[model samples]
Target chain A: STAIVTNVKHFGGMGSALRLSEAGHTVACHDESFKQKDELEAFAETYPQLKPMSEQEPAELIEAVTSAYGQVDVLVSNDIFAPEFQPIDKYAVEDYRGAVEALQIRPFALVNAVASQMKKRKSGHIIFITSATPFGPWKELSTYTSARAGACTLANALSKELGEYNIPVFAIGPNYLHSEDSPYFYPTEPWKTNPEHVAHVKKVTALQRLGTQKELGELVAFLASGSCDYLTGQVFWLAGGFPMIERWPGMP
Target chain B: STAIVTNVKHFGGMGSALRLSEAGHTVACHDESFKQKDELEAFAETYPQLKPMSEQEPAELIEAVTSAYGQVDVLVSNDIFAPEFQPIDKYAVEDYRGAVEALQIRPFALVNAVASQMKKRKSGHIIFITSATPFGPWKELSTYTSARAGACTLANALSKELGEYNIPVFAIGPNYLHSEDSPYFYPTEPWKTNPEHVAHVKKVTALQRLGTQKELGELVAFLASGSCDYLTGQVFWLAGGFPMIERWPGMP
Candidate 1:
């Protein structure tokens, strides 16, 4: 059985779901903010077996999947709240708490709740999607940086705890991705595109271009596959070759 | 002139302060909570220049130093709150916050606050006393481990920011150190002390013993001296020849 749980059916999420479906898993789509109800209804009308479920409550989402498929084999947990970026002094305490609640604390709670079930069944895969900023000091994004850093640590600790049960937990850190909504994709001449983002892409990335959602989906597909059972507790950076150098500037 | 702002004059702090004073710096001893007040008073009586500025606020401590010596040159921010070792689930939220606040945030804030003055004078060195847990995960002390991890990052970031001003920010991550109160020195039989900790002293260490406060002091003295001007923003782990490795069981 194929099942997908998501917050919104963005272009990337829909595309990933479609690819997974075509690969022979039965597909289930869920979203909390699908105000474009007519569009989803229209799409489901064409694919008769495609199930559309509400995503407002994680418990309800998990309940529906267990009722249908008995147990979930893979969880992508790809929920994105809006980016909250500010320097430490400029950030409101409430804003920092909100960022942690959404990005760090809540996602981890969802994973823990779902993971207990997966552990009981003794087979599953969970991948946390994270940002590249956790690898280095980013200016003007202390709250975002701290939350993401905590998320990475959570994934590491969870992987260590859950590995003995044969369940795999991992994280993917992607660099400046170029989607249609991305502002960095196009730039004016003379000033030109500061290839710093792209240069990091070329330097650290084995592949020379910004990563595509499809490629990320493929990575998810591989990790979730049965062959990936032994690979757990690792944070793979999908940035184009961004080397993590430990030494500060002066030291050799 | 010499100044020490500490929570208490434990053997380690008192020993380092004595050595610095012997080396000819005018020592100002400060402690918010000094248990052996009479001992310190007697010690100050012997060295009339060794001022006793007790119960002073941190700002007052800074002011007393500037008023006495004109400028504070080297700041060794060494304060170890009682070590509480436990697993993550066992730790209270306040305990985790307290570890970071004590071991990292407060010390870093003090350094940052004082750094501008040092930078204005175009010279200064700030050394953070860190533990070896940052290099490898300690099973029972996850909170301390995480905070130390964060401190390393802070040291690196500050190093880069202050390097332009010719100020050096360095962190020394020392492995199991032995002081007058060290419990590891006299372990019960069968326990026989941690072999890795012992071998760390014997084989890996160039000095061939658990690090003493004096040995650490010598290293700090060298870094604080004018000869170390070229070195900035680095963490040198003093564990003889102990290599950094992931400690997970069954990991290759």
Candidate 2:
């Protein structure tokens, strides 16, 4: 069996890939950009079972995985694209198109591209690592929110439509994270040295700690398994309870 | 003292437009097409106070409304555009792009065009007549759900962003509605007489009835009025609690 995770050349999570590989499945990876090849290689060095994909297209990826592993069972689209954060008014129409193409259109295209194989097998799991940022409007993130909302609905609709064919789809909307892949850690020395930044994040979340990488990976692992068959089309929020449970004085 | 609803030449809800007018605010209307002129004029005969605008461009619509009414106090982006209903895979990329443009991009453009005037005044209400179809997916509505999901998020984002400026926004997502506008009425005589569709809709809802136009009108009116200034970024579901609260066979 094969599991494919996209955009792993950079933003892809090693935990999910490792968990899937360790569970006796080959983890095949893909990233639209080669810019993150160094980091991609570094991760693969440890997880020898991790397979990097050559075909960039969704249809091609399916074929490539089948040729290599004999079957495609899982597709975790964790790919992300975010342009300049700005007010909706400041976000150009062209920029909006780009954002939708990245998050909305691209995700649907992937689903569409993979539909035939998944349908023929009459079994599959599609997990979208969506954003929790849309739940609470972080200032100047209208573009990103607009894009996520669209594609998430695609998964939502797909789960409903594809369920009859036994192909389950789910969305995992991850909020602020305490991981190295986070762009928040850019200029590593600054964020690494800043105790105040981490403290501030703790103050905001309902849970006093940021979610660990393993917890998210294991959660997705279970979701990709039969344990989560009853749950599909729902976006699981993994943001330390986030805005849903505010840090207001009276709240738990 | 003034309000505007776009895409009214046809498909736009007269309920949202008329209700705002009856509430003592003059309603300005616009649509991408003129297919609904007969109904628009037909409505004007009874509600002379309903101000219909010919200049459809957002900028021009803003100017014309301000000239006639002295101020634009409200905006109800009740647009409608759908090419056809089909599975996501069967849907063409061009069609998906068109759907996104009509709903997502156009809504943003209209919002961008109107923001300066609203920001200057620092007082306004924006209500998006969003569709509830996405909440629970309808087969063959991928194109539409994708588009509305994007625009609706824009409204959701703006509600949070614009609230600081004293402008509140609201979304009224209507589904399984018993209204003239819904094509479910088509083959009009057939649907009007068909007990099966009615029976089916009620069976699926908790209340055993579909939403009525009157209730939706009042809901949108309340949302567009100053009475709802404190409420923003909330999507009101008007589907007789369909899906959210399902009726067991014996419950009724």
Candidate 3:
């Protein structure tokens, strides 16, 4: 009956966790930074039932959740390491290593560590927040893009491996969410936000407009709930036809 | 001009090297193991102009090639390190690391090292051998499949980065080539090699009969040759009708 949201410091992460908390679930908010700790604590005050567990390493966080809640029914591993983006050559090798650790290896290890417990209970939901670059290539942010691509593969592989246990691993790949720092807030070329952006924000979305925190939270809630029992090991892009590439273009 | 082929121990690698050697290019065969040294030596006797280099680390091998040829006009980074097929829990952590080293990291490093020199020279051809798993999920080979998926992203990123320099960095994702150790040799039960495998070997392909060493060689040759100058950072799969997944059956 309890849901553990890991890496709760991220912009999307905070939003996702808040949504889950509002849905009457016993939510545990986790993050690695003190600033994030303060933010999450402040956010959790609004919801008296939501517990705040900040500055804990991933392993420690998972352990605490299991001990307190008796079991973790859902895990949302949504941690973005840093916001600084650069091209591959300009980026340090350490940055690339950090991205892989934050985006791929850590999330995979967390899922693996918790999956056995879920399997023993015969139920669980694992949702990974990935990026759209795995479907295609992103011009900049090579490290972020490649790491997310790795996460996509990890999700698919784990999905297949863990399906029989009634554990579902789903990845959500989002594109250009209109965050506060998003390009839409400050246009580069003709300086207009453009009708196309608005149209994409509206009509282009299969669901319309930039995805709200509530929508993402609702998606996670549904997947964690019994409603999405059948879907597993799939990368669901929430980009709304932002950039569609033919999965297998030609040659068939 | 001289052409260097990495991981020539594999049939496709040797076959590719042979084709280029036959075309009057001085061929340098590089492999991490001496397993195929005798075979390559024997091959060299048949084509006296062939130059075989064995037991060279990939980085060292690339450096050697660049040094000897003054510039490696054609480079193929085909070294793949995949662990024995096993489920997630059954796999060792080293297996995942090895797979990434073989399938993703090594290839990218080799390309980076070689391409740096190629950029100065202003002309070079680089080919990365990936797999069909990038387009969809592969059931058993999680590490290999995941790493290969990373290669596609790397290829696209490099393509965008290196195209302006006139260097072509391409990935060839072959579905299932019928090589010496192929499962088709003694397929089990419902997995029997069918028309697709047979046809791939016998005809339809430019050379015929499940892709031979020569056919891959020819393909690599063309890519390295002037014919594919305009193509870069693109992934081309060699499987006959190994279709990319378009839409899942039930999803709207």
DockQ of each: 0.10, 0.55, 0.29
Query: Candidate 3, residues A1-252: lDDT per residue as tens digits?
Result: 688776554535655776887777777877664346566567567656677776366666778888887878888887565536553435555566677677766776676567668888788888887777556564555666667787788778777677877888888876654443323222222222677666545544445556555666778888878686688877878675666433466733
Each model's C-alpha lDDT? Answer: 0.58, 0.71, 0.66
TM-score order, best first, reads 2, 3, 1
Between candidates 1 and 2, the one scoring higher on DockQ is 2
Task: List clash counts for every candidate, in order.
Answer: 9, 4, 7
Per residue, candidate 2 scores C-alpha lDDT tens digits across B1-252 of 688877543333666776767787778777544335665476457567676666667667778788878887888877667457676567777788888887787777667767767877888888777777777787667778767877778888888778878888777776666545445322223334579876776677778666665676787778776786877888777767677545589885
Q: Which ranges of candidate 3 are over 4 A from the true structure?
A: A34-49, A54-60, A81-95, A179-211, A244-252, B34-48, B54-59, B92-94, B181-210, B229-231, B243-252
Residue A168 accuracy (lDDT) in model 3 = 87
* Worst 10 contiguous positions by lDDT, candidate 3 chain A: A183-192
Give the winner by TM-score.
2
- CAPRI tier for the interface of model 2: medium
Candidate 2: residue pairs that collide: B7-B30, B7-B31, B8-B30, B8-B31
As a whole number from 0 to 100, the lDDT of residue A73 in candidate 1 is 70
> Could you tell me how far off, in angstroms, the CA of residue A211 lies in candidate 1 after the best superposition?
3.1
Q: A83-130, model 2: which lDDT tens digit per residue?
A: 477755566777878888777777677777777677787888888877
Top lDDT: which candidate number? 2
Q: Give the TM-score of candidate 3.
A: 0.78
Candidate 1 wrong stretches, greater than 4 Å: A1-162, A167-169, A179-208, A224-226, A243-252, B1-69, B79-95, B182-209, B243-252
